[PDB]
Curated annotation (Swiss-Prot), chain A:
Record keywords: Disulfide bond, Periplasm
KW Disulfide bond (keyword) present: yes
Membrane-spanning parts: none
Its job: Negatively regulates the activity of the diguanylate cyclase TpbB/YfiN, leading to decreased c-di-GMP production. Inhibits TpbB/YfiN allosterically, through a hydrophobic interaction between the C-terminus of YfiR and a conserved region of the periplasmic PAS domain of TpbB/YfiN. Under reducing conditions, may also act as an YfiB-independent sensing device that is able to activate TpbB/YfiN in response to the redox status of the periplasm. Part of the YfiB-TpbB-YfiR (or yfiBNR) system, encoding a tripartite signaling module that modulates intracellular c-di-GMP levels. The system is a key regulator of the small colony variant (SCV) phenotype, and plays an important role in biofilm formation and in vivo persistence. The c-di-GMP produced by TpbB/YfiN stimulates the production of the Pel and Psl exopolysaccharides, which promotes surface attachment, generates an SCV phenotype and confers resistance against phagocytosis.
Any one of the GO CC terms: periplasmic space
Section of the entire sequence shown: 38 to 185 of 190
Protein name per the record: Negative regulator YfiR
Keyword Secreted: no
PTM annotation: The Cys-145-Cys-152 disulfide bond is well formed in both structures. The Cys145-Cys152 disulfide bond, but not Cys-71-Cys-110, plays an important role in maintaining the correct folding of the protein.
Subunit structure as annotated in this protein's UniProt entry: Homodimer. Interacts with TpbB/YfiN. Interacts with YfiB. The YfiB-YfiR complex is a 2:2 heterotetramer.
UniProt organism field: Pseudomonas aeruginosa (strain ATCC 15692 / DSM 22644 / CIP 104116 / JCM 14847 / LMG 12228 / 1C / PRS 101 / PAO1)
Localization of this protein: Periplasm
Length: 148, 153
């Protein structure tokens, strides 16, 4: 199987890792993951995931302009969006306990809590401490030991 | 407005439609489709497709800078790429008989044969004669019947 498929599977594994360091105010029986925007590496997420603790992660695509993104998702996995679309998305996320992760992220200072860098021999990611604090979920500090 | 799963399913069928007007100089037993770059609407495609005559369309993602896109695929469905990535992709396709379709309607100026516009009530598309002429495949002009009817309320 190809490198894109290889990297897609690793993206799955990395996200499950990140998830285990996150807590929701009220924990759902099924973790809702929404994939939003064009993505290269979200095909493994979209097949479904299950946490170590047994909880099912349900994932589906949703539109960038879906006004209910914040209430529909516990996790958002954010693909390519222009500036106005990005702003649009996070206005919907505001005030809801949503873990946000972007597939690309050279800057990772505006928007998502975490930004993957899928290129190179291994996946790495950056953390946005500000986003992390305004996000609504509790991020265990150990996860920062897993960032680049 | 149309949902993502609805647009994805419809993209499948417009693509099958477009495929029906195309001829490869040596028709393969199995049509190979490669999805290249970030896409919103390719999840239907990537389940694999079947053509009206029963030829299977196998689909898979591949890296933007894979130098063998031209030989690996009969069809390419192109997602979001920057100016250099696009350049890389269409240089890989030159001299090979490849049908290219973009998810977004801006790429018909830069190498793509067809350009989907997935917004609105229907999926519509536009096309580029230069890119078609150099493609190495034959494209029947009635494929625009599909475009016009799609653009009609």
């Amino acid at each position: 199987r190809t490198s894109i498929e290889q990297r897609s599977n690793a993206v799955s594994q990395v996200l499950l890792g990140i998830f285990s360091y996150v807590r929701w105010p009220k924990e759902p029986a099924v973790l809702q993951l929404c994939v939003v925007g064009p993505t290269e590496y979200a095909d493994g997420l979209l097949r479904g995931m299950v946490q170590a603790n047994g909880r099912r992660v349900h994932a589906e695509r949703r539109a960038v302009d879906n006004p209910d993104l914040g209430t529909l998702s516990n996790v958002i996995y954010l693909g390519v969006v222009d500036e106005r679309e990005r702003q649009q998305v996070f206005r919907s996320l505001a005030g809801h306990p949503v873990l946000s992760i972007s597939e690309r992220g050279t800057e990772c200072s505006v928007g998502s809590m975490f930004c993957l860098n899928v290129g190179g021999p291994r996946i790495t990611f950056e953390a946005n401490l500000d986003s992390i604090a305004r996000s609504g979920v509790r991020v265990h500090p150990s996860v920062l030991k897993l960032a680049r």
